[PDB]
Ligand binder design. Structure first.
Ligand SMILES: C[C@@H](O[C@@H]1[C@@H](N)[C@H](O)O[C@H](CO)[C@H]1O)C(=O)O
Ligand SMILES: C[C@@H](O[C@@H]1[C@@H](N)[C@H](O)O[C@H](CO)[C@H]1O)C(=O)O
Ligand SMILES: [Ca+2]
Ligand SMILES: [Ca+2]
Ligand SMILES: [Mn+2]
Ligand SMILES: [Mn+2]
Lengths: 47, 180, 180, 47
């Protein structure tokens, strides 16, 4: 079962030139364990 | 030209190329962002800054990230709050917990936030979430109110694989979640 | 498996994924470690820690790095001190300048240093350098006196291409420097 | 076409911590020269 979403997000308008990336998870009055098992990242910026 | 890449197949107890915030830590070879415990936030960031665009040239970067994650609730009805992949300023720090997913502080668009997040939202907050109360994937930019959403049915305790890719030429951000 | 990769083909003025120490800074597309000025030390480090071996499984990493660099001196006779690529604890800070190249403090072996370096050494320091007096490539572990050295003729002002590879199955470190 | 190669067996695990930083250093003393790096590529893999 796959779920795909796509949108146009002109990143240069919203974030700084240098950024950090990562994950976030929270609980409130209701809760759940949130875990990441593996992570791969690649970015390339032409110049 | 600049590129940054990394992969972590299994997480160790001393994973020094990550920055941990709140209660996020690595255990049993997983990155644990929250345990099934009330009112917590956990975040983990890659330690190197990434050069996502350049003001001098105007070039913008492409990127791809893929990760497997799991949400484990007691039952599939009392589950909250969800999880995020986010891009933020170098000095980002946890923002409000609960339904703001540690990453935003308002439903109101805030240009000083400077972060966009792909959320996997498991709890309906009447005030800003999709009106149909479904769990959903959403793209958030400077607000907890998504610019777009897609309903998703949570498979509790199942491993999910996701790919997020940004193509600078067309400015398109694509999110895919699969349960195998 | 854990991988770290990056490339910087052209350094620019706000290179945030580098930690600069001493007088190193980035200028006119270059990383400048030293200007042609007396008594200076400059170092630059990648910002992310890299996992080079693991105590839980005993595995050590394979790695390769390549870079091109230039040494520009007033003339070919009065040239000093040199350049290093080094591997060191996460908290490394500049050590002694001059002939110690910013990475070591002594010619005596010190296991507390925990630094291995490949040096490109242009000035003969009679207390520890090869007595033939030639400029040389060297591999340094925990001391400025190299465990092995190779004579090299400096082409002043010219770009040099370096590849340094480590093969973990044999624990062999290979260095090659090429001029066009 | 002018090359210089040096090879050595260096058992890194005996000398360096598990987690390291990598980088460049250069210095001058009573004599001097400009030391500059024009590009850098790095890749490591730990099975
Ligand atoms: C964001 C909103 O957070 C909600 C939190 N207040 C509530 O207690 O628990 C639910 C479910 O865990 C959260 O979504 C808030 O009050 O800050
Ligand atoms: C550290 C050692 O370094 C040397 C420096 N002090 C010397 O006088 O100038 C040369 C050329 O720059 C250096 O090799 C010392 O003398 O203190
Ligand atoms: Ca919610
Ligand atoms: Ca010397
Ligand atoms: Mn939502
Ligand atoms: Mn030497």
């Amino acid at each position: 079962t796959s779920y795909t979403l796509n949108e146009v997000v002109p990143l240069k308008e919203f974030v700084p030139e240098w950024v950090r990336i990562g994950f976030s998870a929270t609980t409130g009055a209701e809760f759940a364990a949130h875990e990441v098992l593996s992570w791969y990242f690649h970015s390339e910026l032409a110049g | 030209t600049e590129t940054t890449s990394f992969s972590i197949t299994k997480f160790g107890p001393d994973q020094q190329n990550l920055i941990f915030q709140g209660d996020g830590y690595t255990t049993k070879e997983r990155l644990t962002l929250t345990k099934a415990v009330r009112n917590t936030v956990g975040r983990a960031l890659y330690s190197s800054p990434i050069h996502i665009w350049d003001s001098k040239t105007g070039n913008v970067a492409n990127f791809v990230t893929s990760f497997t994650f799991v949400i484990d609730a007691p039952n599939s009805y009392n589950v909250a709050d969800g999880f995020t992949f986010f891009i933020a300023p170098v000095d980002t720090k946890p923002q409000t917990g609960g339904g703001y997913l540690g990453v935003f502080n308002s439903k109101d668009y805030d240009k000083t936030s400077q972060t966009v997040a792909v959320e996997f939202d498991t709890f309906y907050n009447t005030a800003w979430d999709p009106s149909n109360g479904d769990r959903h994937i959403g793209i958030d930019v400077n607000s907890i109110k998504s610019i777009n959403t897609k309903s998703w049915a949570l498979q509790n305790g199942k491993e999910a694989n996701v790919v997020i890719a940004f193509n600078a030429a067309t400015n398109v951000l694509t999110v895919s979640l699969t349960y195998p």
